Paper text:
Cation–chloride cotransporters (CCCs) are secondary active symporters that harness the K+ and/or Na+ gradients generated by the Na+-K+-ATPase to extrude or uptake Cl− in various cell types. CCCs are homo- or hetero-dimers and their C-terminal domains contribute to dimer assembly.
Here, we report a cryo-EM structure of human NKCC1 captured in a partially loaded, inward-open state. We identified a human NKCC1 construct that eluted as a monodisperse peak on a size exclusion column and yielded homogenous particles suitable for 3D reconstruction by single-particle cryo-EM. We determined human NKCC1 transporter structure at 3.46 Å resolution that allows for de novo model building. NKCC1 assembles into a dimer partly via an interface formed by TM11–TM12 helices within the membrane bilayer. Ion binding sites are organized around these hinge regions with partially charged side chains, main chain atoms, and helix dipoles playing crucial roles in coordinating ions. In contrast to LeuT and many other APC transporters, NKCC1 seems to harbor multiple extracellular entryways and intracellular exits that converge at central ion binding sites, raising the possibility that K+, Na+, and Cl− ions may traverse along their own routes for translocation. Using this kinetic model as a reference, our human NKCC1 structure would represent an inward-open transporter partially loaded with a Na+ and a Cl− and arrested on route before binding K+ and Cl− because K+ was excluded in sample preparation, whereas the Danio rerio NKCC1 structure represents an inward-open transporter fully loaded with K+, Na+, and Cl− ions.
Author numbering:
A (entry chain A), B (entry chain B): 288 to 753
Amino acid sequence: INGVLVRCMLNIWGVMLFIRLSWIVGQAGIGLSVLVIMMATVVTTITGLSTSAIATNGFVRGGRAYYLISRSLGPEFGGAIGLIFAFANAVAVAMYVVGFAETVVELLKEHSILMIDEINDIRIIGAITVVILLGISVAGMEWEAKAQIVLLVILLLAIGDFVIGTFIPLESKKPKGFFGYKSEIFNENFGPDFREEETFFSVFAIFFPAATGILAGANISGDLADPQSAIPKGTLLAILITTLVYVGIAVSVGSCVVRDATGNVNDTIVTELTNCTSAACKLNFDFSSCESSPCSYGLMNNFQVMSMVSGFTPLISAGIFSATLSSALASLVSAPKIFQALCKDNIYPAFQMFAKGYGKNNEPLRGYILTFLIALGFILIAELNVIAPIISNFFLASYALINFSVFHASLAKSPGWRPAFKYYNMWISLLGAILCCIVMFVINWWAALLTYVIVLGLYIYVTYKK
Amino acid sequence: INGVLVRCMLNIWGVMLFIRLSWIVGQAGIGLSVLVIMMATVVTTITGLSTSAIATNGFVRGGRAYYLISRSLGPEFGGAIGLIFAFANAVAVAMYVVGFAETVVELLKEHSILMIDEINDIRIIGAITVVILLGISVAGMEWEAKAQIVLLVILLLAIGDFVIGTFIPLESKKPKGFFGYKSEIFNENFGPDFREEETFFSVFAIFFPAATGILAGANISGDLADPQSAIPKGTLLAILITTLVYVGIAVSVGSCVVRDATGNVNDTIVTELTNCTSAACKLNFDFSSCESSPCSYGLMNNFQVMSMVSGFTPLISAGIFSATLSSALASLVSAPKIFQALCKDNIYPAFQMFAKGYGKNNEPLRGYILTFLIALGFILIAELNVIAPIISNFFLASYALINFSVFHASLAKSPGWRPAFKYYNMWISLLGAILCCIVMFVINWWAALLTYVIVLGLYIYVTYKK
């Protein structure tokens, strides 16, 4: 009730927190953003209750995450969810690491230093980073147990430092959108003023990965040093804490940083008593009239608002490093584990090359190379705002699959289904599945369709390979 | 090999032939229109081969169409295809009858006569028409056997009269877009010049019902006075003939009527030697410069181009009446038959009120009232261009269902599957199903999605009612 809790809590706080939440709230108002977070959290908690019901039905010996599912679910749903989820984690590696690389090139361009083709300097940085990350994962993880705790200490210190910065309204940040909890800054920030082409569901898709750390946080750490049936409590409480801190950070940054701010001491508080519609003039002449040209930063231009508000910004940057690298590595170790587990069962005998445990320990290698290559291929696409909707798609697909499969097995299944989680009925799981599918189709309907024909073909193969 | 042949050939030539084909070719060029027809016909013929394989597997005693399917397919696919297809025919009634009503108000407004709210005078006409059609269907059909033959004589005479009119270039039609097989009229008509908001798939969806008469043409006439295993030959040959005459009428009208023509002897052949880009001036000053205001008619303005080209236009109008009324009535008798057959089996016991055969013969009444009311509700929507995509959706769904179900049963099914149709393998049926689903999603993805959750809920009900 402490190990997998910390694991999920690490997996969930990812890149989208420090570098995208300000974005989201800047586009979808302080109000509607809460609806975004609430939809995300209801999907996640439906899936959490369902996966809990899974984690409280079978034998006490939880072999492997995918093996746990295959025990508690048919090989059709088993292999489907497994493959689609391992792919989800594989692409998630690239998502997290490219967010990291983005913040690196940001903190670097802040200096005098520069690189070749920033839009692809991100690509070079991400490549070196994923190489070093694979090198970390393979050949050693004994230290990760103690490393996750220090990472979480760093991360919580970063969040607390952010909030402690909010209450400290330095005048030098007046040229930035930060103003320190003004009511009118909150008023003007409640209406969902969107931007160039984003719609509510585009923003939701961007945000959704920031709520996706639950299953691999819990299940992938099957056979935990803790009892198996402790997973649900920690998973759900972690969901609650993460979503609550999401809501808090959301409301705070919305009531703190204005929609746009061209940092210029010149364009400042000179205080000509004008018409004064927006909240900027309400504060002072600072951050006035970005409507003409694209301004530098503030809640809708730059993603560095979080690092801009807090005190001793190094701690916030360290928190970013911790979150992104940690989540990326967790996904990078969970994905090939699922691959090798599914392949050792030879459920899909086409990928019979289960990496043969090429190592002194049971360290798969073929899966590592595969997911590393996928991560590279996706890293090549730089703009995180386009990688993230794909992860959104695939994780929504995975969640739909899993909770729908629970719903289906609930339709009486001779295989020992017999779950135990309080509040784990079928109808809520069918609700979650319909929600997942609908939401997935609203965000790039054709991607969802293609995903579904993929899983259909998987059902075919699993149906006639028997 | 003559009865169900004539039946399908009647069901297929519907309203979309005489009043929409000219439209389609006017928007999607003489060339691309052939691709439209080819996609339609490949879908239809895949489904035809599959339904043939069905019609050549089971007992010699073909009880009922839906019963034939339930014999040769599981009650899941059975009831799904049955309900969705009966609904398809129900809405098809309204489609055909509203096309009829449209041509009636056209031929009436051509006179001095008029009605109240033409856009809903169509609705009033359609209501009276569907009332009279229900009155025809119930309480007597003994004459329909001899009536279909005279209807087909009328229809073929209309088509032949149309083509015989093409070769007769009356000067009085020069103010209309008709010119009589000019090469340049064909050249300018090969490029898919679309219009206000139509896309290739919008046009395809409009067209697709014009290729949907096969299953109900053949299966609904189960226990034919002909042997059961004669269905495939006639069905496929009817498909071939209908699609070939579609291609012929398409190429002809494309090479005959220009894209736009403001009928005015004044704006005519006066023959000022201008720049002359379009083919109009190539012919003469007639039908020149519709680009300014919306012109009266010709291959893109009015749907009466077909009736405008032929000689003794009354015959063409009679052919329209024959086609629309005939197809409408065939659908109106096929839909409730499927309803009462599915309900007598009580597959979906919610609709246990199977009309109890309230009549001296086995004449269902509850189903009649139901489909009549649905037809009314849809008639209320007047613009055929919006009703037709819905029928396209639902028929694509039905075809996807049926051929996919054949594909699935091909994955070895202990129920006696054992078909016989030459060239009836699985892979082509899976191809047809994937095509149906993809095409259905390109045309109003959310309608397709909703249809699929409907059939999923049906799978639920059929799964836990057992």
